[PDB]
């Protein structure tokens, strides 16, 4: 059948496997040439290296796509810093496909917010590495604040650290932490947090 990758390639000695998801590449190096059926086997095979490569032009890409690529980059980087036991191909690949899927979704949410954000009083979006900064502002509501959300490739399944810089009104860290907690850790998390913030703090 198929998987979430467009293409799988391997070396002539079959020790190095490349998996491609558009502009994203994951390279897996086995201790020795792979024999048998790596996805069906269930055979212990020693993996000595896992590498992320990116085909992305940082100069010709929306900051959102860059964020996406940076999150997967950092995800694979931190994964490899484990150096008694290692993950095995099928598992590695399942998790990775899911991570890529969800991070691409996230990029789309960012695009939605860049376009439609003023409808929720979201007047600025800034991305710095993995930090997403959202400025909410309304003279009418008498509320202005910027929350910093620290994202990860595990998005949206994990709770987000956050920080707030308050300017006008009474909005606090606690209020924001509360809102983040109420929204279900699943698809559209970010769009749903923005909506929650709008309803609670700007409709009110
Ligand atoms: Cl196979």
mmCIF file with all atom_site columns, N, CA and C in Angstrom, residues 15-17 27-32 46-51:
data_model
loop_
_atom_site.group_PDB
_atom_site.id
_atom_site.type_symbol
_atom_site.label_atom_id
_atom_site.label_alt_id
_atom_site.label_comp_id
_atom_site.label_asym_id
_atom_site.label_entity_id
_atom_site.label_seq_id
_atom_site.pdbx_PDB_ins_code
_atom_site.Cartn_x
_atom_site.Cartn_y
_atom_site.Cartn_z
_atom_site.occupancy
_atom_site.B_iso_or_equiv
_atom_site.pdbx_formal_charge
_atom_site.auth_seq_id
_atom_site.auth_comp_id
_atom_site.auth_asym_id
_atom_site.auth_atom_id
_atom_site.pdbx_PDB_model_num
ATOM 1  N N  . UNK A 1 15 ? 21.480 0.362  3.468  1.00 0.00 ? 15 UNK A N  1
ATOM 2  C CA . UNK A 1 15 ? 21.723 0.701  4.859  1.00 0.00 ? 15 UNK A CA 1
ATOM 3  C C  . UNK A 1 15 ? 21.133 2.068  5.167  1.00 0.00 ? 15 UNK A C  1
ATOM 4  N N  . UNK A 1 16 ? 20.955 2.867  4.123  1.00 0.00 ? 16 UNK A N  1
ATOM 5  C CA . UNK A 1 16 ? 20.432 4.213  4.280  1.00 0.00 ? 16 UNK A CA 1
ATOM 6  C C  . UNK A 1 16 ? 19.098 4.356  3.568  1.00 0.00 ? 16 UNK A C  1
ATOM 7  N N  . UNK A 1 17 ? 18.084 4.785  4.311  1.00 0.00 ? 17 UNK A N  1
ATOM 8  C CA . UNK A 1 17 ? 16.746 4.935  3.762  1.00 0.00 ? 17 UNK A CA 1
ATOM 9  C C  . UNK A 1 17 ? 16.286 6.369  3.870  1.00 0.00 ? 17 UNK A C  1
ATOM 10 N N  . UNK A 1 27 ? 16.142 10.762 6.971  1.00 0.00 ? 27 UNK A N  1
ATOM 11 C CA . UNK A 1 27 ? 17.092 9.751  6.546  1.00 0.00 ? 27 UNK A CA 1
ATOM 12 C C  . UNK A 1 27 ? 17.453 8.860  7.705  1.00 0.00 ? 27 UNK A C  1
ATOM 13 N N  . UNK A 1 28 ? 17.320 7.563  7.477  1.00 0.00 ? 28 UNK A N  1
ATOM 14 C CA . UNK A 1 28 ? 17.608 6.590  8.507  1.00 0.00 ? 28 UNK A CA 1
ATOM 15 C C  . UNK A 1 28 ? 18.742 5.674  8.097  1.00 0.00 ? 28 UNK A C  1
ATOM 16 N N  . UNK A 1 29 ? 19.767 5.637  8.935  1.00 0.00 ? 29 UNK A N  1
ATOM 17 C CA . UNK A 1 29 ? 20.934 4.819  8.668  1.00 0.00 ? 29 UNK A CA 1
ATOM 18 C C  . UNK A 1 29 ? 20.967 3.612  9.594  1.00 0.00 ? 29 UNK A C  1
ATOM 19 N N  . UNK A 1 30 ? 21.003 2.431  8.991  1.00 0.00 ? 30 UNK A N  1
ATOM 20 C CA . UNK A 1 30 ? 21.087 1.185  9.739  1.00 0.00 ? 30 UNK A CA 1
ATOM 21 C C  . UNK A 1 30 ? 22.539 0.771  9.927  1.00 0.00 ? 30 UNK A C  1
ATOM 22 N N  . UNK A 1 31 ? 22.837 0.124  11.051 1.00 0.00 ? 31 UNK A N  1
ATOM 23 C CA . UNK A 1 31 ? 24.179 -0.403 11.297 1.00 0.00 ? 31 UNK A CA 1
ATOM 24 C C  . UNK A 1 31 ? 24.702 -1.239 10.136 1.00 0.00 ? 31 UNK A C  1
ATOM 25 N N  . UNK A 1 32 ? 23.825 -2.050 9.565  1.00 0.00 ? 32 UNK A N  1
ATOM 26 C CA . UNK A 1 32 ? 24.185 -2.851 8.410  1.00 0.00 ? 32 UNK A CA 1
ATOM 27 C C  . UNK A 1 32 ? 23.050 -2.938 7.421  1.00 0.00 ? 32 UNK A C  1
ATOM 28 N N  . UNK A 1 46 ? 19.411 -2.709 14.093 1.00 0.00 ? 46 UNK A N  1
ATOM 29 C CA . UNK A 1 46 ? 20.055 -1.617 14.801 1.00 0.00 ? 46 UNK A CA 1
ATOM 30 C C  . UNK A 1 46 ? 20.121 -0.386 13.907 1.00 0.00 ? 46 UNK A C  1
ATOM 31 N N  . UNK A 1 47 ? 19.556 0.722  14.380 1.00 0.00 ? 47 UNK A N  1
ATOM 32 C CA . UNK A 1 47 ? 19.658 2.000  13.684 1.00 0.00 ? 47 UNK A CA 1
ATOM 33 C C  . UNK A 1 47 ? 20.740 2.877  14.323 1.00 0.00 ? 47 UNK A C  1
ATOM 34 N N  . UNK A 1 48 ? 21.691 3.344  13.520 1.00 0.00 ? 48 UNK A N  1
ATOM 35 C CA . UNK A 1 48 ? 22.799 4.136  14.053 1.00 0.00 ? 48 UNK A CA 1
ATOM 36 C C  . UNK A 1 48 ? 22.659 5.641  13.840 1.00 0.00 ? 48 UNK A C  1
ATOM 37 N N  . UNK A 1 49 ? 21.739 6.062  12.982 1.00 0.00 ? 49 UNK A N  1
ATOM 38 C CA . UNK A 1 49 ? 21.565 7.488  12.748 1.00 0.00 ? 49 UNK A CA 1
ATOM 39 C C  . UNK A 1 49 ? 20.200 7.835  12.177 1.00 0.00 ? 49 UNK A C  1
ATOM 40 N N  . UNK A 1 50 ? 19.660 8.963  12.620 1.00 0.00 ? 50 UNK A N  1
ATOM 41 C CA . UNK A 1 50 ? 18.443 9.509  12.039 1.00 0.00 ? 50 UNK A CA 1
ATOM 42 C C  . UNK A 1 50 ? 18.634 10.997 11.725 1.00 0.00 ? 50 UNK A C  1
ATOM 43 N N  . UNK A 1 51 ? 18.414 11.363 10.465 1.00 0.00 ? 51 UNK A N  1
ATOM 44 C CA . UNK A 1 51 ? 18.685 12.717 9.977  1.00 0.00 ? 51 UNK A CA 1
ATOM 45 C C  . UNK A 1 51 ? 17.496 13.435 9.335  1.00 0.00 ? 51 UNK A C  1
#
